[PDB]
Subunit: 262 residues, 6 copies
């Protein structure tokens, strides 16, 4: 049981809890409350004993263009700038990043197009990623926005792409392109479908997943994930706290607001 959100839906099909970003006209840009909603859906999936896999799917040509700048401008009532940003940015980010970090079900991202910023951080926290075609990329534009690492990217990017690649991309605001994703095994399967039909891609992933789970003992999947998660859980939780608190001086100084308004 949870409120409805017009930008994000979910459903359950057998052992699969499927979350769908459904706002393609705005490239599935997300506001603060939408990130919170996403975290609440993960927590709902996590409490359902019939769910073994949580699948995140999107719509249109982008997975998500990241945080909604119009919503950010609306957040610019509180005794100080610090208090405002603690409520609007710190809170949201620590909550949703935490929901991904601790999630006990196998978390699969269907990457139907590019992801940017905090949405791309969340993709990097998923356990398995499938791409629609070779035009997908991840962009973390923090240096261009006057921000720093978010959503656990301090840990996930070096871990999944290597340290030297991560510095080149983050320091100079360059994308992690399809080729770098394939070379680091970030994408487990490219479906090579046209960008004009995310829907067909999403259905095809689900169809393959129904085939792949046949005969598996699903509690083994969760048992294995529980052990695998313990390799970096501490580093992720440490990073979440420091990222969110260290970002405050950037917001309070004002640079991101200037730049979020080109």
């Amino acid at each position: 049981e949870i409120r409805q959100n017009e930008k994000i839906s979910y459903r359950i099909e057998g052992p699969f809890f499927i979350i769908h970003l459904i706002n393609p006209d705005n490239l599935n840009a997300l506001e603060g409350e939408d990130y919170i909603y996403l975290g609440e859906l993960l927590e709902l999936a996590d409490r359902n004993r019939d769910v073994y896999f949580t699948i995140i799917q999107s719509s249109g040509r982008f997975f998500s263009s990241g945080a909604d700048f119009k919503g950010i401008a609306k957040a610019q009532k509180y005794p100080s700038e610090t208090s405002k940003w603690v409520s609007n940015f710190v809170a949201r980010n620590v909550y949703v990043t935490d929901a991904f970090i601790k999630h006990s079900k196998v978390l699969i991202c269907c990457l139907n197009g590019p992801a940017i910023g905090l949405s791309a951080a969340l993709v990097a926290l998923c356990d398995i990623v499938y791409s629609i075609n070779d035009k997908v990329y991840l962009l973390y534009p923090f240096a261009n926005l006057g921000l720093i690492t978010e959503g656990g990217t301090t840990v996930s990017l070096p871990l999944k792409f290597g340290t030297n690649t991560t510095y080149e991309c983050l320091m100079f605001n360059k994308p992690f392109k399809y080729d770098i994703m394939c070379e680091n095994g970030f994408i487990s399967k490219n479906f090579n479908m046209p960008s004009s039909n995310a829907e067909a891609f999403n259905a095809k992933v689900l169809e393959e997943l129904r085939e792949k789970v046949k005969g598996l003992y699903l509690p083994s999947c969760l048992g294995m994930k529980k052990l695998l998660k313990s390799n970096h859980i501490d580093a992720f939780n440490k990073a979440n706290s420091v990222e969110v608190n260290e970002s405050l001086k950037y917001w309070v100084d004002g640079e991101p607001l200037k730049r979020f308004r080109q």
Copy 2:
């Protein structure tokens, strides 16, 4: 430069940045915005190159009775809505404040000294346990962490600080059964570095006397060494504190959302 707050003041005297909780009629109970203010003051002290020591002092017979329950009830009565869910409300009201103020203490680079003029409770007691040095007014001080009785869990880094400073077995006895860490336990674990043995009716005299002794003790010291040493000492547990901060604040949410603390905060 910072706004004023009627419940907390500060001043600078030489190398000392002094923070004073000044609401003794309410036992220096603090609302969310006051915890935030406290974190902002630490960050202000941390940026001031003339400050080597940040001293936290209070007033009256309590250091602080903890989070203000009236303010907590305000975050439940509406007051428009103005939140799409209970989760969203508690993320903004509890998660955010706690993660911010705990972090300000954990990372503080100046020597952080607590003048314990009476008991401390809850999140305020957690902050006392994050200070580097603690002086007590007399042997009637105690720390109480009443999480089990409020339907909550560890806050303000107590997951790490209590076992570290009081031992694990003592921590379980106190936290599981809502029992205070009393003066004798504090002294036996070296938590209190000096008991001034003054009457509880004059926090003001105690506070002045601590400052007077501190002015004497710093004479002849090379103060950048103090900071250099703290910078190394902090690295022993910094990772564990930062990890605990994130986890404590997120794991509390289900307790707030379930509603138990609100029932219990009501008497």
Copy 3:
């Protein structure tokens, strides 16, 4: 549901799962299968959603004199000495130590008299310890038996008694006496009752516990323990594996067997 064991019983009273060592004529010395049984009882308590506290109580004048030497002599069928000790010692020790380390309920030991060896290791893994009187002590006689640290004592003893004290006691086979236990806050309450009535002591602890839990929100107790456990869980699990494997060369060399037979 579990088999019966004549040396160890259990019962449930409200939120308390009570385990009772009931072989005072043999000072509650335990064989390998009894340590395993103890681990199985912990795991049973851990799965019961009505249990919040697991209380371990004993009988007579000793809590437990440790591993039963007669049973050890019986273990002296297997292709090698290594294989024998892997089955008899390694297996038992890793299993029972693990059951204590991961236990999610609040674990309380009623110390009715001295504990020795592996039984004393288990006492040091409990969250809270109450003593009957000031004659209790813990002895870890590994240096005298030709063995090394067991039951997580590599971590628990320095953690609960300090490093320098631990070296003095372990290197020279000296007890951790009541005074050192009180000074390190290892014992949370001394009941100051006569050693001739463990039964009255055990009942009195339970009576105080029923009083102390009134008004508490018990899920908070478990929530707090779950966070507290994460401080050292990794070090305990690492120690368990190394202790058990490093002990093998001592058993295979034969020294403990000579000495276990004075």
Copy 4:
């Protein structure tokens, strides 16, 4: 000095301690006592001051098909009892063997080289992933960890070794869906240091050719440097491996005791 085992032999040639799995008709499937024997051989090599490299070689078209299911069925049919409970049985049969052999690999101080003459499966594949260097016979080798299909979880340190050597996302795809780590994935992650590109019908020629190249490569090296370097490299993940060993072996128990793997091991 050690007993003989008809399924595994060893010999020493100069600085090389060579272990050979010699039961190709059964795809070098191993029973519990064989895993133990393998650990004993590692410990023997580790104590020999003339040995600098421990080389593991196999026979036939498979490196090893993993744990022998017939032997597993023996540990279920009785065979007197002779165990007070299912838990006690599995502690002795599974827990004990796994924790011992995994530990022998994790702590081994000599350079550990695997000659991969064909596929490896299960616990045997876990041991391959614990070796320092791996050479393949041809591009048809693969590693399979079929835990999800057997109703089990990670074994032999794979909790740590697979994400470390293949990356996290690749590891989840393979483990969650019971898919092999194929040659191409092995090459792309640098898991295989050299592919010899020889036919699968002659493991013997492959094994000899690896040894021949190794005799050439060690010429002129100061061999104590190899060991000194390994001693430092091992410290990067030694704690994580030891922690994982204990947890893997204990967490598997509920899967054995519940019975699922026995049903599934039966076809």
Copy 5:
């Protein structure tokens, strides 16, 4: 302010602190005091608030052939062999490795040819590496010199090249060649220029860097690096201390000196 060194110069251009190894006739082999000098330059760059990037460039056909053996022979006054090597090797290595490990500016290496030994260790500690052409390699000849890992290679090589590749190269004294560097993303861009003009390569890298920093908020770069560094800082500091002390027995035994003399 710092003394001059004829083998290494530096200059500052805008946000770039540029260090130039300028002894191509000796393949930029470095003596102990030159490594120390290099550490001092990093520490100077680190204290300059206008510097955001520290760029290390070399000359000729080699980046650096490593420690100068003629200088080593000079070091073979002190009460013991141990005391001599503590002063000559331990001290310098622990200092320069530490300067690279803690450096807070973005550290970029312009790899104009091969690097060997301690110089190659320093290349592996840089955040970003650009290569002149596909003939560059790194060689860590410790096994052939009778030494062990240096300059944090205990951590940096498995981290950046993987553990199995690291064992093959280190155990058998084999280079990490261009192909292995590209496959692990160690090199972020190959400029594909001729080895006869390091100068042109160096100028071209600086030109591209000036282009890539345009529009970026440079304090974000440093903020991000400060978080990224925390992933492995503890392991690097631990390794530094252990590498330098464990190498002593190799120097004192004398093997490296015999071998440094062929």
Copy 6:
């Protein structure tokens, strides 16, 4: 085999390797080369298979007053201040601290009077400490000398005395007195003998040790220590490297030299 040193002797008696500081007229103040010598003696004891305990004893009324200031003034040939202090301070500290941290034999300190500075740091690295009488203290005067923590005190002091006590003593240059030592179990036994006869104290400790080892299986002592050491070995090695490098800016700035001259 090792050279002789007039300020420090050693001998072997059965399983005991006994190191004796023998310069009471100068309160056993030690120069750099004497610290190095002390490290070499530990490494000699560590390589001797008949040694199970390494015992450090001193003479006169002080254990050691710390680093010899006259020797420090001599050290104030080198291209820079940095290079000088790297050779004189960094090198020696990193070497001797490492020798104590890694030592595999049981390390016992006979505290015949106060210890100061780096010598007191070494006392805090010993496994077991016995005091002559209740007038012993440890003083770490770093704040008064314009230095920072040394000899692993960053880790050993909070570990053995607690964090709040450590801040009070270090920040304000106050001694850890006998009472604080006894309350934290730092001292395992006070012999309560007069300060005018260190020799009798030293002989009495050895006599009690010969009595306490009787019947023990000494390889168990070492086996246990090897496991106990792993609890904090990484933190000690990390601290060693950081302490020695971070102290440099204090020496180079000059403050300690001014203050070492009163």
